[model samples]
Target: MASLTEIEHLVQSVCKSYRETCQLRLEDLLRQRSNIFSREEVTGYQRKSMWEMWERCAHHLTEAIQYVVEFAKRLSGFMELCQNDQIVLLKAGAMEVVLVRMCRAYNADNRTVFFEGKYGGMELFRALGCSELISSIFDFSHSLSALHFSEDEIALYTALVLINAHRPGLQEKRKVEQLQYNLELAFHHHLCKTHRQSILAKLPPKGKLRSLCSQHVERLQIFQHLHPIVVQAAFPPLYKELFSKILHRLLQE
Candidate 1:
């Protein structure tokens, strides 16, 4: 067993890696001279503009997904799993991890999220025509940001989410379970050292993530039904491969 200090060091390295790779400082976006739209301006756009907005959001989401992939690759022991199990776990867990990661980009003060160089509220996403899903995402992000987790805490929690043992189609349950247990230990050590034991109780239940993910898929289905052409042509290829592939399998089942 690793010493608590060693575990802490490992956790901090993970946090450093995440900060280096995934941190999206909203101020930097402004400093870079990117266009930042207000909620009113975004909502004022018509249908074609809405499609463009959605397409930009899809691009941002695809980038976030790529960051999550990099984070997973850095997790200790994650690559030891067979390639098939790796894909299955990522297929089931990536969105949930991405949702968790959203808190970094969330501005709890005004109930907005940084998207496409702007801090967008739910109104900015109305064009998607899935109010409930967008609302749920904001609600979840709001609640998560309220916890005010440090970067290391979020990194550890993300590891736990990605290494989940129970994702369907996993062929090596014991190996994944061991990885999950090790991550939990590191997570626990981190909280204890930081005097944040209360966060353990405050953490959202696994069911919350599961429900949120289902809502996302439901909204994607609605979006696809309404704009099949946009989905086929406008969405990023990685976004389509990750989500549309899941939707296809879900429909088949």
Candidate 2:
């Protein structure tokens, strides 16, 4: 069993590694942009054609998935899964991870999401007619942020998402279940030792997985309908790899 202090330290160190390597931490992304966009910036942005706008959104979404998958591959027991299992986890895991990261990075009061290292509002998705979809995401974000999960708790949740044995078609289900069990115990130990059970009981992790993923799948199905299969051709090689991996999982299921 990992000690609470030790697990807390682990959380901090893992988060730091992600900040440096992934460079997508919320504050880091926010630091790159000021809240204000000049009149010229506004005018210049509106000049793009509809295709250009949609393609840009596609590009950014792909990059977001890429980085999340990259970060996820670093988690404990992640690489231990078989190849198909690895891809299945990453495929399903990407949407949830992106949602979690966006929730972490969202400014609920401002109604903005730090997307692809840029602050985006409804106007960004207006051309795609996806403002309603984005709004649903924002609502989810607000709920998640209200819980105020610490870095340790979020890291643990991320682990649980990656190792989720309940995901369809998981091989070695028993092994994955054991990993989740230990992590759950680790979470309990962290809460008990830190004496934060009073705070955490209000936001326990038990029901979050199914509910959050239900929202994510709904979000993705909507996006998937709008996304042309040929859109894969518009992306670079790296994004092609990431998008293809996700589409493969989607198609199979």
Candidate 3:
């Protein structure tokens, strides 16, 4: 069993890699862009405008997926899983982890999210035609940020999210459960040490995360149905591949 200090060290090193690879500063993301859209353009329901917004969001989402993959690689016992199980876990949980990480980029006071280098309120994302999904994400980030989790807590929480044993199609469920148990033990110890045991109760329910992810997929299906060409042209190949199952299922429906 890993001691609490050892777990803390592991979390610190993995989070350092995350900061290097995934963390984007608002000023840095904003400095390169010109031709800022007007409020009218952002709120417009025009397909072209929607496509543009979706494209930019998809770009960032792709990067978040990359970060999740890297984080998983560094997680203890993750690499030891069979390749199929690893892929299955990522497919099921990457978006949840990404949503958890988004708290860092969220401004709870302003109710805005850092998007494409700007702190954007819900109205700014209205053109994407996924208001419910956007709002849920914002709400989740708001609640998460309210907890004021330390870097170690966030890192451990992220690990817990990604190492779910409940995902279907795992060849070694028992092994996965054991890994999850170890993480839970470490997380509990860390929380106790920091006097943040109450945080366990405040963490969003797993069902909420599932519903949020499902809403995102539903919105994506609708968007793709309306603008298949834009999805093909704009979304990164990795993003498409990760959600390929849902996309294909959309075709059958």
Per-residue lDDT over 1-253 for candidate 3, one digit per residue giving the tens place of the 0 to 100 score: 6776776676566556455546564345435234344566545534457788788878888888876787777777888888778888988998999989888777766676666545567777777888788888888999998899876788788889999999999999998998888778777877887799998889999999999988888898998999999889878887888764532332223
- Give one digit per residue, the lDDT tens place, for model 1 in 1-253: 6777777777876677667657465356435333456545765643436567677777888788777777777777877887777788778888898999888777776777676556667877776666788888999998898799887889889888889998889999999998888788888988887899899888999999999888877777777887899999889887887777532332223
| Candidate 3 lowest-lDDT run of ten | 244-253
Given candidate 2, what's the lDDT at residue 61?
A: 66
Instruction: Note the Cα lDDT for every prediction shown.
Output: 0.77, 0.61, 0.77
Task: Give the Cα RMSD of candidate 1.
Answer: 4.7
The residue pairs in collision within model 2 are none
Better of 1 and 2 by TM-score: 1
Task: Identify the leading candidate in terms of TM-score.
Answer: 1
| Residues 1-253 of candidate 2: C-alpha lDDT, one tens digit per residue | 6565755665555455355435355556556556644455555555666456656865776667766666656655656767777776776676676666666667666666665445656565555555666666677687777777776666666666666778788877887787677666666666687676775556536455456556544544554566755345564454445443454443244
- Which stretch of 10 consecutive residues in model 2 shows the poorest summed lDDT? 244-253
TM-score of each: 0.86, 0.73, 0.84
CA shift of 165, model 1, Å: 0.7
How many pairs of residues collide in model 2? Answer: 0
Ranking of models by lDDT: 1, 3, 2
